[PDB]
């Protein structure tokens, strides 16, 4: 019975029951891990065996972090997270540091266990049940539930916020120059110091934490070639918005005109000061595409004009923290991908392009998920909320490997879409 601190009550949104989601197949390598980290968590008594009598369930899977080489359990609590929210959002949410984005270096600490020391409301436990498959279905499902705040459930950080704010009072007053944000199982810390000086302050916060029970993972730094550990820090500056740009030809065939009209038309929805008549007139009658139309001096007037319009801050775009977040991703070409994050259609708050990880093994699946993660990360830092994704891929294909490449404590909300090259619009060049 872990702690004599009082249990805070939680009740799911009205007229909604707990999560009744099935367990997806799991690979040995993982089952084996998930079995251990599960066995040992039950002894410490943070978890409890349970049987058929509990009508709920959620999926678990584990990811061998490339960050620390130590498997991490992962429970997909999205449905539950969803069914419980008057709670963690409206009632007792955790505020956002406007300036966390405005730093040059920021690191994320996996303060998961920090949660394993606070009792979860008895009555609410049934809802966090999960099951463990067995290869070739050798034995039935071995299933448990939580007795203490679970890792990766919108509610934990919400509850543990009282104790998590305290733990930091000292560090925050002994280093006011640093910023600290907590989104679910993670702690976002960013400084303006030299990198070497940052790394330190981090490694120092790790200690201060330790001076309190909060044990944080042991990230490794290898000395052989790809010094991957060199990127563990995030830099909210090489973070540049990606505006649309209109080509630059010397002479324009018909074809090349039409396309450039579309783009200009599509983009007309974003920025309104985009006129096309004076430039479409040049295509007045049924003519072979291949025909070199000479640009009028009344025409080339707006081409070079509207373009000037495609390089500034959109139409008074405001972020409303009380509305969801959406993100689209278009597979551009040979490793490139682009995204846009908006709350309202055609009123994006951000637009950019995730380049590529040289070790992308020429895998779209891999790169896509990575983009998701990457894109997700930016969200949390910038607005402190995860966006719903519109993934450019087939549900049944993504659902088959997104795990294999996943390396994060959270999981965003997504859906699939087959929406072809609308207009090279979300720009390729």
């Amino acid at each position, epitope marked *: 019975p872990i702690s004599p601190i009082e249990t805070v009550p939680v009740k799911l949104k009205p007229g909604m029951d707990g999560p009744k989601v099935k367990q997806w197949p799991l690979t040995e390598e993982k089952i084996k891990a998930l079995v251990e980290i599960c066995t040992e968590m039950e002894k410490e008594g943070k978890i409890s065996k349970i049987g058929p009598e509990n009508p709920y369930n959620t999926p678990v899977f584990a990811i061998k972090k490339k960050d620390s080489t130590k498997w991490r359990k992962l429970v997909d609590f999205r449905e539950l997270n969803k069914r419980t929210q008057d709670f963690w959002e409206v009632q007792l949410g955790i505020p956002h540091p406007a300036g966390l984005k405005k730093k040059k270096s920021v690191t994320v600490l996996d303060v998961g266990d920090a949660y394993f020391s606070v009792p979860l409301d008895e009555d609410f436990r049934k809802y966090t049940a999960f099951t463990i498959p067995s290869i070739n279905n050798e034995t039935p499902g071995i299933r448990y539930q939580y007795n203490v705040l679970p890792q990766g459930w919108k509610g934990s950080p919400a509850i543990f916020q009282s104790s998590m704010t305290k733990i930091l009072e000292p560090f925050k007053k002994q280093n006011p120059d640093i910023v600290i944000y907590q989104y679910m199982d993670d702690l976002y810390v960013g400084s303006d110091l030299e990198i*070497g000086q940052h790394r330190t302050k981090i490694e120092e916060l790790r200690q201060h934490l330790l001076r309190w029970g909060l044990t944080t993972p042991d990230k490794k730094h290898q000395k052989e070639p790809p010094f991957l550990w*060199m990127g563990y820090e995030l830099h909210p500056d090489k973070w540049t918005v990606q505006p649309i740009v209109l080509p630059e030809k010397d002479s324009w065939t018909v074809n090349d005109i039409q396309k450039l009209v579309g783009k200009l038309n599509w983009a007309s929805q974003i920025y309104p000061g985009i006129k096309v008549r004076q430039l479409s007139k040049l295509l007045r009658g049924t003519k072979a595409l291949t025909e070199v139309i000479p640009l009028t001096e009344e025409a080339e007037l707006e081409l070079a004009e509207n373009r000037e319009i495609l390089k500034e801050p959109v139409h008074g775009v405001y972020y409303d923290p009380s509305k969801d977040l959406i993100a689209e991703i278009q597979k551009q070409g040979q490793g490139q991908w682009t995204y846009q994050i908006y709350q309202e259609p055609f009123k994006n708050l951000k637009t950019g392009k995730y380049a590529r990880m040289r070790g992308a093994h020429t895998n779209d699946v891999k790169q896509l998920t990575e983009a998701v993660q990457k894109i997700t990360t930016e969200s949390i830092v910038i607005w402190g909320k995860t966006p719903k994704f519109k993934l450019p891929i087939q549900k049944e294909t993504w659902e088959t490997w997104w795990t294999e490449y996943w390396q994060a404590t959270w999981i965003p909300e997504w859906e699939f879409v087959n929406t072809p090259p609308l207009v090279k619009l979300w720009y390729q060049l």
Partner: antibody
Amino acid sequence: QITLKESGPGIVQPSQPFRLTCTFSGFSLSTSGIGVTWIRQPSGKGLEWLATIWWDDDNRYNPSLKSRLTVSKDTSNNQAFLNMMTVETADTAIYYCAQSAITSVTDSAMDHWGQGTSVTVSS
Amino acid sequence: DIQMTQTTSSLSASLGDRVTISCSASQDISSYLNWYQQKPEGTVKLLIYYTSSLHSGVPSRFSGSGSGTDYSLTISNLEPEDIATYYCQQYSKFPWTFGGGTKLEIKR
């Protein structure tokens, strides 16, 4: 504004040990990338890598000699050490200690060198 | 034990010339080669890191090239110091290793 200087015994009797000391200023052996490398260079022949003590104490040795090597560091005094056991004539050489450092995701080089010490084995 | 080999041992040249030295590896070292200059005295300095990046304070007349297993160092137009012994070190896998070095001399 960075420099290292190897300190030594200059001359060692056979089958005895020697302890080279690198004393540096300009960088800490506490800062991430940093580390110190011990190079060697026998009479007339070319450079040889010997060991690199890193800030995380994740030291790496030249397999041919690990059995007679050891690295240490008095981080507070900016000193770095190298010990060799049971030396033989072939150990007679010039030893360098350099300030190896890992700048970024792909760059890891021995930015600055010492001048070396003359260690020779003779009875 | 990633053998590093500079075939050319003793090469002689003359002021104003342009020279190239080769550092052949023993496996795809994926551009983790470094070049070192050791003057007649003995002091050793860092020319190029990451096979083609000039260490701060090095004369532009210095260039690095290489890929997979074959790599080259090229000195624009010789000055009277350049004439010295040269080394390339690999760091794709400990143990680290240096070439056999190439002594750059003077044609008389």
